[PDB]
Design an enzyme around this catalytic site. Structure first.
Site, PDB file in Angstrom:
ATOM      1  N   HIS A   1       8.586  -6.580  17.758  1.00  0.00           N
ATOM      2  CA  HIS A   1       8.504  -7.511  16.641  1.00  0.00           C
ATOM      3  C   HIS A   1       7.771  -8.786  17.028  1.00  0.00           C
ATOM      4  O   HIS A   1       7.147  -9.424  16.173  1.00  0.00           O
ATOM      5  CB  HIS A   1       9.902  -7.844  16.127  1.00  0.00           C
ATOM      6  CG  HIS A   1      10.657  -8.784  17.010  1.00  0.00           C
ATOM      7  ND1 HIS A   1      11.324  -8.369  18.141  1.00  0.00           N
ATOM      8  CD2 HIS A   1      10.864 -10.118  16.919  1.00  0.00           C
ATOM      9  CE1 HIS A   1      11.905  -9.408  18.713  1.00  0.00           C
ATOM     10  NE2 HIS A   1      11.643 -10.481  17.990  1.00  0.00           N
TER      11      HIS A   1
ATOM     12  N   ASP B   1      12.313  -1.515  19.034  1.00  0.00           N
ATOM     13  CA  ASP B   1      11.606  -2.767  18.763  1.00  0.00           C
ATOM     14  C   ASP B   1      11.066  -3.400  20.046  1.00  0.00           C
ATOM     15  O   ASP B   1      11.180  -4.606  20.270  1.00  0.00           O
ATOM     16  CB  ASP B   1      12.511  -3.744  18.007  1.00  0.00           C
ATOM     17  CG  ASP B   1      11.734  -4.860  17.323  1.00  0.00           C
ATOM     18  OD1 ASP B   1      10.513  -4.976  17.563  1.00  0.00           O
ATOM     19  OD2 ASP B   1      12.348  -5.620  16.540  1.00  0.00           O
TER      20      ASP B   1
ATOM     21  N   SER C   1      13.131 -14.411  23.031  1.00  0.00           N
ATOM     22  CA  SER C   1      13.347 -12.979  23.126  1.00  0.00           C
ATOM     23  C   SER C   1      12.639 -12.417  24.351  1.00  0.00           C
ATOM     24  O   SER C   1      11.571 -12.888  24.752  1.00  0.00           O
ATOM     25  CB  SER C   1      12.843 -12.283  21.863  1.00  0.00           C
ATOM     26  OG  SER C   1      11.475 -12.575  21.641  1.00  0.00           O
TER      27      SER C   1
END
Lengths: 162, 49
Positions: free
Chosen positions: A39, A61, A113
């Site tokens: 993402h 992801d 992230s």
């Protein structure tokens, strides 16, 4: 004393992900495999890794890639075992219990992230794709590795992408 | 006798029609079974316990 823990935590380095001068995330290598959240899009800071062909994971992801042999020595060591307690993370120590990792509320946001979680010995336990604040703590949508050699992604309910 | 609604042409005709229409159904069933078992495989790989 937490100062020594922070000093040990701030020892190793990762490779950030850039998009037009903006760091949308980080791209770490552990065990000879290149990882970055799917993402999160951008260009990895290092050119060579950015040149690597990667494949996508629909339900996970993130992307994966084999590092070159001549650079596989310079990789972070993993740990399938996760003893109960607190772990070192780039922003700060992570207190985890019941198999889910929690951080103090207000710590961690977008662009954090993919930052790996290190144990006391520096071995990476899991990496974070996102997190959601649910009160005094903030559960993280981390992906862990099982003892048998498998991959597990504990994502809290209605978690927030980072 | 000019009544022709089913008028089964031959046993071979019905056999072939079953073969090429119905075998596709078998392949569909196999694919569905594979999808279900790999879904359970993902479930157990994530957390068998």
């Amino acid at each position: 004393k937490r100062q020594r823990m922070v000093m040990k935590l701030e020892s190793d380095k990762t490779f950030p992900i850039m998009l037009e001068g903006k760091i949308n995330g980080y791209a770490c290598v552990v065990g000879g495999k290149l990882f970055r959240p799917m993402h999160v899009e951008g260009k990895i800071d290092n050119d060579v890794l950015a040149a690597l062909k990667t494949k996508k994971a629909s339900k996970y992801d993130l992307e994966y890639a084999d590092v070159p042999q001549n650079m596989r020595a310079d990789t972070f060591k993993y740990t399938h075992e996760k003893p109960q307690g607190y772990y070192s993370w780039h922003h700060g120590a992570v207190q985890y219990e019941n198999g889910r990792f929690t951080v103090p509320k207000g710590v961690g946001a977008k662009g954090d992230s993919g930052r790996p979680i290190l144990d006391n010995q520096g071995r990476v336990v899991a990496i974070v794709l996102g997190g959601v604040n649910e009160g005094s703590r903030t559960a993280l949508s981390v992906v862990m590795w099982n003892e048998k050699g498998v991959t597990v992604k504990y994502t809290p309910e209605n978690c927030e992408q980072w | 006798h000019a009544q022709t609604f089913t008028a089964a042409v031959s046993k071979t005709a019905w056999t072939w029609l079953t073969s090429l229409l119905g075998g596709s159904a078998v392949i569909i069933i196999i694919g569905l079974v594979l999808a279900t078992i790999v879904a359970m495989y993902v479930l157990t790989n994530q957390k068998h316990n």
